[PDB]
Design a protein around this ligand. Structure first.
Ligand SMILES: [Cl-]
Ligand code: NA
Length: 129
């Protein structure tokens, strides 16, 4: 599923991400924009052989099991494929656990490089929430 901007903002708000750990909704939408272009089916391979999955590009090195990342953790305890569903629930729950592990949203490179310190509220302007 390729979300519309406001559509994803609303699905995200409903799943408890607005102001989660102090990160306003614009942050999550901005990160999703640049991690996945709002596409739940996005996958990207990393140099170390781990893979990033879904709307928020969650890494199999630590967070999900994909059966092809030797020595990795499965800290969200899910198959990585569940992160590709059109239902963003699993991606959201895993993201909450990530954002809470000490480093906040800096875990997302694209957030760090393209969202942090910008006007993220712009990402939810116009939306009915
Ligand atoms: Cl933080
Ligand atoms: Na893993």
């Amino acid at each position: 599923k390729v979300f519309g901007r406001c559509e994803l903002a609303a699905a995200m708000k409903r799943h408890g991400l607005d102001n989660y750990r102090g990160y306003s909704l614009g942050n999550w939408v901005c990160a999703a924009k640049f991690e996945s272009n709002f596409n739940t089916q996005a996958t990207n391979r990393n140099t170390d052989g781990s893979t990033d999955y879904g709307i928020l590009q969650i890494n199999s090195r630590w967070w999900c099991n994909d059966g092809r990342t030797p020595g990795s953790r499965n800290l969200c305890n899910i198959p990585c494929s569940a992160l590709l569903s059109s239902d963003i629930t699993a991606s959201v729950n895993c993201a909450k656990k990530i954002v809470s592990d000490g480093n906040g949203m800096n875990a997302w490179v694209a957030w760090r490089n393209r969202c942090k310190g910008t006007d993220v509220q712009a990402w939810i302007r116009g939306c009915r929430l």
